[model samples]
Target chain A: DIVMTQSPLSLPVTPGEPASISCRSSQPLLAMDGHNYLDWYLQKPGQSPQVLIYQSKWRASGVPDRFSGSGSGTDFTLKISRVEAEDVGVYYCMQALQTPLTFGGGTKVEIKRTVAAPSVFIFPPSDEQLKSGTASVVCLLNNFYPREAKVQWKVDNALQSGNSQESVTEQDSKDSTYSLSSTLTLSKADYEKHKVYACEVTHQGLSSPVTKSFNRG
Target chain B: EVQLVESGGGLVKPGGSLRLSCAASGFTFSNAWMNWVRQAPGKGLEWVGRVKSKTDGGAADYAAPVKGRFTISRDDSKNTLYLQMNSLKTEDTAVYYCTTDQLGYDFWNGYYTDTLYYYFGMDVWGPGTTVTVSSASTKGPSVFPLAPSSKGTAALGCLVKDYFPEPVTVSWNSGALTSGVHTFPAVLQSSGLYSLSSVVTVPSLGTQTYICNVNHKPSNTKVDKKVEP
Candidate 1:
């Protein structure tokens, strides 16, 4: 399988203007038959992802000619002649070159809507979680706009590194807002030594990271 | 629509520099990796080096033997790749082929975070360019015809006996008669010499003549036998 890397995680576009996203594969996407094993699609707000381009440049059925794909082998680009209000969503590039088909980090396109900062909540480990000698602390974020968000954990105002897992972003169907959760796992002994645990979430919607703290006391 | 063409192949004297060219088209030259492979006359293939388009932050990898003496580069403005080797010898006489590299990745435990890159190998090869080093030791093969036999189809046979240094090629004249032809591997005889045999199966015997041609590389010699059945 090939690893696909996409650029411009956030795309701010104006209606009736052009937009482009670049995608690169760790390996050549060209097959022996001379067709590139790459595809491009858009996931509109609260809608399923729809293919815009396939085999590198061929437009998918019912797709507009204004949207096109170019390049071959490892590097590729997807371009839209004019961005529409309906095109405000996420664009992704996928590689079908081999098994375990992989997708590029999505690029979110927006029309500069008002920001709705995420509200953060932190939860400490329960007794059952501590019994295993390791504890899990979860940080939940709700109601953010325009997609991209970063999460980090801290101990007493200093950055703390731990085993972490982030959930897939979930969008609110009616409001078009997004929410997700991040979990940090750490040794119970280390968790007890910390006086306070904090979860910080950074997003373009917020002037500063939203930090929620849980005092061990 | 994709294609690759190799050129700049010819004779080079000892200690001379050798340069080969590969012209590319119908694809993004800077986006793919190109490789150079060679086969010394009658020998197995060897990877010389690999490089990507120079204009695109080009990088290269070379086989240990040719690491210092060989250079792989490209002129993206012209969509052409060049392979240059310094200080040639008789051992370097061979056909050089150009190919495109395919990339792949492996994930440990199926986790994206643990993904590792791996080379998938080459596809889309260019027609080979032959280079001669102008030298060799010698011994040519003796040609003989085995009695013709038939199992419904006519089977004409030839034996290439008593050759030295073992790099010989055998072929039959008629292209149609060459189908289903079988050639035996060269065997070292008790006399410390090499011998081989070949048989060509033809549909039926007419007044047509089939000729077997044998070429011994080291000795720079050729022997042929005219077979009629």
Candidate 2:
């Protein structure tokens, strides 16, 4: 059996940041006849692993060419170029030519925002002659990870810090592991068309406050 | 980024059973299917089977196609897939590979219109595991490293029956022989039996030597061909 080991068991990356992972084997993976059997995979935070490269550098079926793998013998690397918001996840290396198959430890990636802004924001209903005085509003964020961040609402541009009337539910994405949520509540006549609601969240390492604005009409 | 960290190799006596695992980190287990392949020393690859973490419905779905012999299952919560080969014989000595199929490429269930496309040519592979089997007994014959001649066309062939346990590679060389193509004969079996043969063509057969390498494990024996017909 071949033993595989990876360095830097974990790594952190900002959104759009380039990342890489390495896989090493205990034995010369080159077959007795001289064929190298090393491959790479990527497991986004909560998704199943996806084959990135096989047979050294042959891109796996449907794999984007941008994700490249190279190296020979016992050492190999998987490189992700121009990482996107969707690219945050763990990366692994596997060798198929050896037995007792092995994979490297994974790397974790996070978004790095350079600009400072409101931490959270919400969208309120547009008034047209409220027949029943009910509407749906949502809280949105451009990028997040670990699905651990929290979101809350504000009224009249003031933090509704302790409001319990609003209901929030999170949806986990299939495409990426990140989570998002929307808050729904019935607005009082006075609270409509004259108040501003904001969604604020405090997360680790994020410097800019992520916020969005909505007007009630 | 996803990481696949596999367990270490194991040594087992002939007729003994064996098990191994490939654990995935930094990724979710339900996104794709995990697969296992085997390659005997000096032989090509053979697809063992696959298991889907999301839909495998436990141990039943992870069972390998080589019934009663091997099994593959996953621990979705732990992000690990298990492989077990039972009643292991000397012939079972080989490296096993565990890998995840590419996002859309279905190596196990997909259809290939042409049989030729089904050639066990796994485009992507995991580093393999080497298992050596021994009977505590007889030593196998040593293989000779003979170069192939390239002066003329050289043809080599073999006839095999059902249950062709051994595989051979053909190569040709010239003027002491430096390099040549290696070929494996396809197998045709009837009722529980099969025959196998391989032919190697060398442009310069007289000046270079042609070699046929047959690898049989447990005893770890090899056979070489010095002449061509």
Candidate 3:
């Protein structure tokens, strides 16, 4: 039997936000038949658990496409791209292929909000220097009500092209917030010296990007 | 909507008795059958037994080959099952799963079975309870020293200090160990300590260390001392 444990015990998200839950198994869940029977489930405060993903990658019937599952073997994750009012709940992972099947401890999703103006937080490094080819950058915005936000990287105040971006808005701690990140891969020479790269966070009322300058020595 | 919860942990002394239960709520007492399954730490699931729900009272059933002293009985209105085993021994340490039987079906070639096809496999489960048994009897070979040599065959003795009173398995990692004949003889030791010994033989040794893994119920832990020869 495989033992499962979940982390972050609890999470906060706002309406129209994004959230994620991860499940890890003590042993590789890939059965001898080569199928990984890992699945994700959501349980609202008063409802029975609903299956979100089965076999690790396939989404359960009627599940929103925004709810996606990835990873394999003993390590697997579930991502909800955009959260809605109906998304508040506790999420867990189940391994269907093993005897005495188990579920991760579970993480609660709550709504988070900010009383004042919205704020954007960026994860990863800005003006990130790479060896010679491509590098990635991520930006996160937390503590915003209603969780309507966008994130992007710009060079000289213009949105950078050919970049990958993802947004996750979820409820946290009874409030709503938005979390978004973007990654871009550029040549090392593009960041030769001090580079003024900026991450923009935009919402309905506040459409301006929160710009942060970075330099590569 | 009914919820079943179980208390955690267990304690038993050699030759003592053990009992555990799972309580329920949120559903009608007659709605389902509450069953108990045992899982030794790090082991797979084992069907210990179950108690059936009836209008009058509940009846318990155990897996075949199970000793008689281990009894499972249910309460009035079929709410809970009482698992009691007498003459407790150390091998009975494992997490016990309590669950409500969910309806399921199995189909064969153009044939169908009713609820029988829906043999219980826990779709819903309780957190589980753990039990451990211990004893002060030194009359048996309570300990087996690691074998001296990693080569050829060696005779390993397992000391069951008291009456096992229940089924058990002694598994070895590197070589095979056979169950010794059941006999009781006491030897007086220094300071008046009495010891009993059960002897089993191990075949060719290998890299994997030999282990005497024992399994009972309520709890399960391994007692292993490697062998050199």
Worst 10 residues of 2 chain B by lDDT: B114-123
Docking class of 1: incorrect
Q: Where is model 1 more than 4 Å wrong at Cα? A: A1-217, B1-31, B38-46, B57-59, B74-82, B87-96, B102-121, B126-142, B147-151, B161-168, B188-194, B213-224
Question: Lowest-scoring 10 consecutive residues by lDDT in candidate 1 chain A?
Answer: A167-176
Question: Would you list the rank order by TM-score, best first?
Answer: 1, 2, 3
Whole-model lDDT values for every prediction: 0.69, 0.50, 0.53
TM-scores for all candidates: the values are 0.37, 0.36, 0.33
Tens-digit per-residue lDDT, A1-217, candidate 1: 3678888988877667899999999989866656887878676642334567777888866788889999987999999898766666778887656544566877887664457887665656555446657565656565577668899988888886636656534343334466655656677898888878788888888887778786872
Best by TM-score: 1
Superposition TM-score, candidate 2 onto the true structure: 0.36
Candidate closer to the true structure by lDDT (higher is better), 1 or 3 = 1
Interface RMSD of each: 31.9, 28.2, 25.7
Model 2 RMSD vs true structure: 28.4
Model 2: per-residue Cα lDDT over B1-229, one tens digit each: 5556555345567777777778776655555567776656534344576664454333333223355777887777788778877777777777776766523222433665532111112333354455555544333322222122121233232221123233323333322442322222333322322223333334544564455555444334545544433
